[PDB]
Amino acid sequence: VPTLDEVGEMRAVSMAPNDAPSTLAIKRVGQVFEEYDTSSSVMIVLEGEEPLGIEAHAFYDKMVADLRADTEHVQHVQDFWGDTLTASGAQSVDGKAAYVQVYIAGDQGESLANESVEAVRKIATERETPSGVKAYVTGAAATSADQRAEGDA
């Protein structure tokens, strides 16, 4: 059989129990609104040097399209920065950053969630970005995935 590290990586266990009220609440929200059925989410952060402009909006929209295209991992994306009504909440006070919350397949800790986080990072990083704009995938699920990866390392 393979090494213990690989087997442990491919047989991870979700950190939260199913009976946990928080997980139940998140799944209830997902199923009621008919958007998703997971319980783990990550927040992609677009940081810019100068205040973000229209080209930043175009890049953001293209990235959102790419995310929503991949139905395997990404289940639902709420583009608050995209709509003008809620655009104030997403963008920072200085106007040099903006974040979008993305739901990934699989619950936190579980290997499926780690794979989904890796796919999200790949999508957010591989695309050519406007000069001065950088993408960073952060959040609780990303932190859990990094924790497991560093322990195994």
Binding site: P21, S22, L85, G89, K96, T138, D146
Partner: protein
């Protein structure tokens, strides 16, 4: 050392900085605040459509009750799309012979000016004591887009995004949940929303 013992739940403190999660956290904390990266979600579900002003009043009451809780920075929802009250929503905002007639016309314009001053004063101070959304505003596409994000397709439930003050992954951050649930339950009391189901979720 027993009395001073305490625990924290933020795993970014237990990792090297070079990891991608720590880098993203560093960027976000440079620009945003910490609580925004780990928000909360609350869903109040009923059995009837809430896409009408009468239920909007109760929804805004619930939002105010949630925000007034200690340690909660801002709450955004269908009645507060960007965390601030919707503009032009306060009640005060809603509030020879020819020569004689013209003077009354001039007086009316001055009274019209007076009402504008009060509206601007209430808008600038972000007052939120009173609230009313006229039925016409429900027809505008701006609220059509909003109601498809913060409300279910059948309109039986509405989601709230709750953002803490400071780091939300501390002991107090985990202890604020019961206060929020109690506040929501008390806000619902006495309204047609009685009998609803409340779900609280998020990292905390």
């Amino acid at each position: 050392a027993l009395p001073g013992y305490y625990t924290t739940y933020d795993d970014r403190r237990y990792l090297p900085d070079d990891v991608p999660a720590n880098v993203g956290y560093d960027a976000a904390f440079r620009h945003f605040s910490q609580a925004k990266m780990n928000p909360d979600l609350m869903m109040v579900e009923t059995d009837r459509d809430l896409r009408n002003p009468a239920d909007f009043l109760v929804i805004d009451k619930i939002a105010k009750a949630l925000k007034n809780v200690h340690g909660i920075a801002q709450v955004q929802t269908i009645t507060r799309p960007d965390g601030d009250p919707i503009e032009h929503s306060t009640i005060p905002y809603t509030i020879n012979q020819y020569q004689v007639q013209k003077a009354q016309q001039d007086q009316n314009m001055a009274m019209q000016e007076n009402a504008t001053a009060m509206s601007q004063a209430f808008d600038a101070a972000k007052n939120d004591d009173s609230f009313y959304l006229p039925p016409e505003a429900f027809e505008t596409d701006d609220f059509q887009r909003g109601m498809k994000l913060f409300m279910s397709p059948d309109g039986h439930a509405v989601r709230f995004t709750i953002i803490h003050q400071g780091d939300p992954l501390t002991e107090e951050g985990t202890a604020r949940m019961d206060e929020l649930k109690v506040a929501a339950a008390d806000a619902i009391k006495g309204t047609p929303f009685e009998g609803a189901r409340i779900y609280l979720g998020g990292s905390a």
